[PDB]
Amino acid sequence: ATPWQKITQPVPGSAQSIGSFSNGCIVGADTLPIQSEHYQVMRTDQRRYFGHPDLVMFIQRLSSQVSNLGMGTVLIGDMGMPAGGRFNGGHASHQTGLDVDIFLQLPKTRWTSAQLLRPQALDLVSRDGKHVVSTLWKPEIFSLIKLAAQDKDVTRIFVNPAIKQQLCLDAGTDRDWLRKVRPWFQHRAHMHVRLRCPADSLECEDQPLPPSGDGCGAELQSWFEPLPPSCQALLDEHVI
Amino acid sequence: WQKITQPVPGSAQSIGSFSNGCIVGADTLPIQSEHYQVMRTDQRRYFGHPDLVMFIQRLSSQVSNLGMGTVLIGDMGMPAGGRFNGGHASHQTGLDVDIFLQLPKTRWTSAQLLRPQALDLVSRDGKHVVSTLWKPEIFSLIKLAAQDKDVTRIFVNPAIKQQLCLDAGTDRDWLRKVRPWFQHRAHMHVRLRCPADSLECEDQPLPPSGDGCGAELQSWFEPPLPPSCQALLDEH
Numbered sequence: 001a002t003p004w005q006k007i008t009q010p011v012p013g014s015a016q017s018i019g020s021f022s023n024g025c026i027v028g029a030d031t032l033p034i035q036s037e038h039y040q041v042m043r044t045d046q047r048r049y050f051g052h053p054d055l056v057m058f059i060q061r062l063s064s065q066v067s068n069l070g071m072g073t074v075l076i077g078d079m080g081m082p083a084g085g086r087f088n089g090g091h092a093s094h095q096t097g098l099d100v101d102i103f104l105q106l107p108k109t110r111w112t113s114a115q116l117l118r119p120q121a122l123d124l125v126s127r128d129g130k131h132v133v134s135t136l137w138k139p140e141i142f143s144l145i146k147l148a149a150q151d152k153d154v155t156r157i158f159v160n161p162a163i164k165q166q167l168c169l170d171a172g173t174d175r176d177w178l179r180k181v182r183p184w185f186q187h188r189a190h191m192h193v194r195l196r197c198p199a200d201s202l203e204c205e206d207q208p209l210p211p212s213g214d215g216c217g218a219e220l221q222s223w224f225e226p227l228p229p230s231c232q233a234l235l236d237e238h239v240i
Numbered sequence: 241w242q243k244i245t246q247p248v249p250g251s252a253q254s255i256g257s258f259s260n261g262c263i264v265g266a267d268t269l270p271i272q273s274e275h276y277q278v279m280r281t282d283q284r285r286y287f288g289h290p291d292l293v294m295f296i297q298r299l300s301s302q303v304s305n306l307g308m309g310t311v312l313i314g315d316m317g318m319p320a321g322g323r324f325n326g327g328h329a330s331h332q333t334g335l336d337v338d339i340f341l342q343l344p345k346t347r348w349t350s351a352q353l354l355r356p357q358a359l360d361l362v363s364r365d366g367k368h369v370v371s372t373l374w375k376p377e378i379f380s381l382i383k384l385a386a387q388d389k390d391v392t393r394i395f396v397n398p399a400i401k402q403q404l405c406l407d408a409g410t411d412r413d414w415l416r417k418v419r420p421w422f423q424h425r426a427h428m429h430v431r432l433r434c435p436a437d438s439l440e441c442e443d444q445p446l447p448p449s450g451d452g453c454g455a456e457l458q459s460w461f462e463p464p465l466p467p468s469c470q471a472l473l474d475e476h
């Protein structure tokens with residue numbers, strides 16, 4: 001285990017996302033409040049409910065919007081570890097406090113602590129991967145994803161290609177936000193939301209914009225065929 | 241109607257409805273063009289209203305000169321229109337045309353045109369287009385047809401409409417003209433409005449409002465002969 005995987009408390013300091021989403025860290029990370037009227041937090045035993053203040057604010061804003069549209073409870077998965085860095089177990093992003101997984105269910109009855117520790121995913125996609133399951137696809141999930149994508153701090157939302165396909169069909173005229181939706185493997189039961197580098201995180205590295213347009217055509221069809229010096233310095237000064 | 245082998249002399253007039261009518265003064269689609277070829281000419285079903293001929297000519301020159309291949313024209317109608325002995329419910333008034341959803345990059349031979357080989361663009365289960373066969377040139381063929389001011393409807397398999405809904409981007413209004421129907425996996429059926437100088441042609445109402453990429457599309461993945469037409473038959 002790396003020091004990043006063992007630390008239990010954020011590094012004190014002005015909030016700073018340092019490096020790139022898949023090679024970085026964060027100083028001064030905020031903690032997502034566990035108690036909220038609008039969302040609940042899955043798998044808190046992992047201690048991955050930390051991130052940039054912008055990420056916490058985003059979760060709070062999105063969840064308030066969802067609640068005010070009369071929808072159910074937003075379910076929050078992995079943000080990042082207290083000082084960011086690479087997880088032990090799975091994906092390599094979520095290193096700079098700007099990535100969050102959100103389950104694509106909005107339960108009308110809040111989940112228990114046991115349900116939150118061992119969450120039961122709902123696959124929204126057909127076995128062959130070609131389309132969403134029509135009896136599971138809900139306008140509320142379209143709205144959850146669209147509300148996230150229209151937020152100015154969001155750059156990308158990774159979802160299964162079948163899910164982007166349905167979003168594409170449902171969007172109508174107000175569809176520019178689809179550009180932020182990026183097809184990826186899996187992501188049948190959760191979306192992965194990514195925010196832009198915070199304005200004052202000078203050592204944070206942004207990605208280029210996605211390809212132009214909604215992305216609902218050729219690109220979608222094709223889917224159906226060492227640390228940054230300032231992070232290393234935290235180790236050299238013995239802070240992780 | 242099979243027995244009238246040449247267009248009836250007179251000013252061009254589409255008479256009656258698409259599935260119960262005929263045409264006086266039908267134009268003939270020229271068999272020879274650099275922009276399109278005519279399938280099954282042995283059946284002698286390349287006749288229709290001047291507006292249909294002109295539509296085929298301008299669609300085809302746009303498609304061909306965009307470098308997307310030449311167009312393959314199927315049935316228009318008989319020389320005086322009228323009901324078919326089989327296959328077609330419509331194509332009686334000179335305002336319907338079948339067009340194959342293949343754009344040959346070199347001209348088909350006479351034998352290929354006489355016995356045309358369809359290319360099924362749709363999956364076996366009907367739920368999507370075949371990912372390796374759907375191409376931007378076919379999107380463009382259908383879009384250019386649908387954006388034509390004289391066209392009212394284009395019938396295609398629901399999987400094809402779904403794909404057009406995905407490809408259209410922000411320039412979408414023409415999607416309303418595209419109507420899902422059974423089959424139509426290898427051809428589109430284009431329909432034109434009644435000509436502006438029509439005397440007794442019957443139009444259909446507009447399609448349902450909107451692009452049609454929502455609930456209607458989703459649901460697919462679950463009178464006597466007009467007197468002028470009788471007079472044509474009587475005159476033999």
